[PDB]
Amino acid sequence: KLQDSLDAGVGNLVDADLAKESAKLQSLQTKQQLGVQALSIANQSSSSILSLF
Amino acid sequence: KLQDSLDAGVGNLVDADLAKESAKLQSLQTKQQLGVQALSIANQSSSSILSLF
Incomplete structure (x- = not known):
């Protein structure tokens, strides 16, 4: 019984x-x-200013 | 008989x-x-908003 108690405790x-x-x-x-x-x-944002030129 | 009665009471x-x-x-x-x-x-609830994006 004591060994089952230690096993339940470790669990x-x-x-x-x-x-x-x-x-x-x-x-x-x-x-x-x-x-x-x-x-x-976030990656798409850089291309918006490509239209500027 | 008294022992039988005491066992019946414990039961x-x-x-x-x-x-x-x-x-x-x-x-x-x-x-x-x-x-x-x-x-x-309840665990499936989070998936619904993936369709919105």
Whole structure:
């Protein structure tokens, strides 16, 4: 019983809560796609003054 | 007879009625799977605004 107690304790110290991780993964993936789109939008800005000449 | 009565009293004090526990187990498993589906639907919420950009 004491060994099972130490195993449950080590699991309480280290084990991750994966159900949080799935939601944070989905949010971070959507944020990555939005950041790539924002990078393209920022990249377009330089060409607007090409029409000036 | 007095020992039999004391054992019956201890059983009345601590023992559980498992027939209620069976229906509670079925309802709780169904509620757990429904909560997992609700969690997935909550995780999908962020994706809708990618279409706007």
